[PDB]
Amino acid sequence: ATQGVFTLPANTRFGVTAFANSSGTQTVNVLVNNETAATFSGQSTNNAVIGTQVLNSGSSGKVQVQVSVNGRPSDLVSAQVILTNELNFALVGSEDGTDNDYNDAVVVINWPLG
Ligand SMILES: *C(=O)C[C@@H]1O[C@@H](C)[C@@H](O)[C@@H](O)[C@@H]1O
Ligand SMILES: [Ca+2]
């Protein structure tokens, strides 16, 4: 199935944060209105926070996460979790290789803010 795609409430602020756990340099693209709105990059095997940003979910609310390592797209896994009918997490893991730990870039989207 498609992974890394989340429908947020439209025109709404959200946080997006990426962590790295791989020998390979991660490039994380966050898309709003179907175009890259933020790019994070780094190289860490100790969960470095390679980027964090506040974005707006855009006209449709559709937010997409894509991850690449040396120009090759990583395989994604994702889910959305809601606590007390109010607090939202959109979660992405990604795999750049063969060990299937899916932590090579980890992305956490959260809303509402403020
Ligand atoms: C290459 O070594 C594979 C790569 O980096 C490792 C250190 C480990 O984090 C693995 O999950 C990642 O795919
Ligand atoms: Ca891996």
Ligand SMILES: [Ca+2]
């Ligand atoms: Ca890893």
Ligand SMILES: [Ca+2]
């Ligand atoms: Ca608050």
